[PDB]
């Protein structure tokens, strides 16, 4: 069959690229030293590094390391400092949020103090990383779309961790730091407040997540289809339209009656991805503070389905018949 352009047939290697520069002097903070990976060269680029080391990055790294070490050492101490038992129960341990009886006051170290300290460190680290991603775009002379799309997810992060506990007046409304405990928190939160399926904003966030996954599948397939016309060089196609863009647009116009441009599809992708955490945070912020039962809300607003048939196994079969006796 024809070449499908999933793996590269032959690789070439030249002198390492150090990066572009301007009067802002990005070179003064970049590291020296690069590597090449032939295993990754089958899919993408082979050069590894260098990286830019500012102050926001160092602060974020140190503070996130502190949070990681606090959580890990608390989990280790909870098991008796036994390394085999620490390894055995790794997925089951956690650092629990404070008890409901303490409200918004600072709890003791045994019942949530370390949780608050680690949460403060994690918040500082995340904000430092966001500031770094803004500063890099400001110094290379580019737009700030990356910072906005990160802020989109930071919004849901903050809603799940900071704003909602303050609105509900308790530090016990946060999420524990664990693998299985956090899934347990998800399920318990869903059960406690009715059914989260009947929250309209959860449905909207699900809609946008599905749309975003569908849109990347479509765009990846489309770009790999027209790569024989140099379709992967999107910027030059935007500045000077070629046949690849025309064919890509005509495919979708003949398929579903409307199409896009080489620059407009990226706007669609940006918005579908960004709209998910925003709707999710808006929906989460209204739970408990405004609505306490979502199934009752749906019933009162008349979009809860009704069933006619009966309940129970004895209405459909027999216990002996099920066993085959």
């Amino acid at each position: 069959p024809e070449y499908q352009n999933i793996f590269t047939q032959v690789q070439v290697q030249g002198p390492a690229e150090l990066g572009v520069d301007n009067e802002n002097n990005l070179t003064e903070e970049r590291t020296t030293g690069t590597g090449f990976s032939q295993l990754i060269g089958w899919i993408g680029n082979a050069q590894l590094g260098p990286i830019y080391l500012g102050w926001f990055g160092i602060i974020s790294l140190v503070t996130g390391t502190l949070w990681f070490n606090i959580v890990g050492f608390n989990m280790l101490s909870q098991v008796g400092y036994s390394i085999p038992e620490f390894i055995r129960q790794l997925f089951w341990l956690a650092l629990e949020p404070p008890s409901p009886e303490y409200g918004l006051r600072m709890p003791p170290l045994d019942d949530g103090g370390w949780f608050i300290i680690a949460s403060f460190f994690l918040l500082v680290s995340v904000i430092s990383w966001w500031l770094r991603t803004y500063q890099l775009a400001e110094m290379h002379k580019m737009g700030k779309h990356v910072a906005w799309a990160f802020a989109a997810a930071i919004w849901l992060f903050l809603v799940l961790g900071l704003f909602r506990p303050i609105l509900m007046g308790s530090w016990s409304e946060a999420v524990p730091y664990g693998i299985f405990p956090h899934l347990d928190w998800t399920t318990a939160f869903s059960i406690r407040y009715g059914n989260l399926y009947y929250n309209p904003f959860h449905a909207l966030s699900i809609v946008f997540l599905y749309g975003s996954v569908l849109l990347f599948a479509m765009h990846g397939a489309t770009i790999l289809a027209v790569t024989r016309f140099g379709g992967d060089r999107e910027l030059e196609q935007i500045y000077d339209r070629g046949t690849a863009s025309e064919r890509a647009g005509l495919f979708w116009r003949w398929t579903m009656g409307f199409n896009a441009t080489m620059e407009g599809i990226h706007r669609w992708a940006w918005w579908f991805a960004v709209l998910t955490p925003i709707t999710g945070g808006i929906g989460i912020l209204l739970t408990g503070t405004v609505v306490d039962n979502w199934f009752l809300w749906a019933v009162e607003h008349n979009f809860a389905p009704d069933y006619t048939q009966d309940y129970g196994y004895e209405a459909y079969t027999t216990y002996d018949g099920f066993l085959g006796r």
Binding site: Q309, G312, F322
Partner: protein, 51 residues
């Protein structure tokens, strides 16, 4: 015989069709082996609610 008229009257890919025939019998062979993983271990269910 006289020959196999394989001088200039036979510019042929003698294997092309058979490769397709063998490929055809390939996907129909792996389907049986895939459905074999689960059918011998049958399962029965008991209904406790509306359809």
């Amino acid at each position: 015989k006289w020959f196999d008229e394989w001088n200039s009257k036979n510019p042929t890919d003698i294997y092309k069709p058979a490769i397709v025939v063998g490929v055809a019998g390939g996907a129909v062979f792996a389907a049986a082996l895939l459905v074999s993983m689960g059918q011998p271990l049958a399962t029965d269910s008991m209904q406790t609610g509306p359809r």
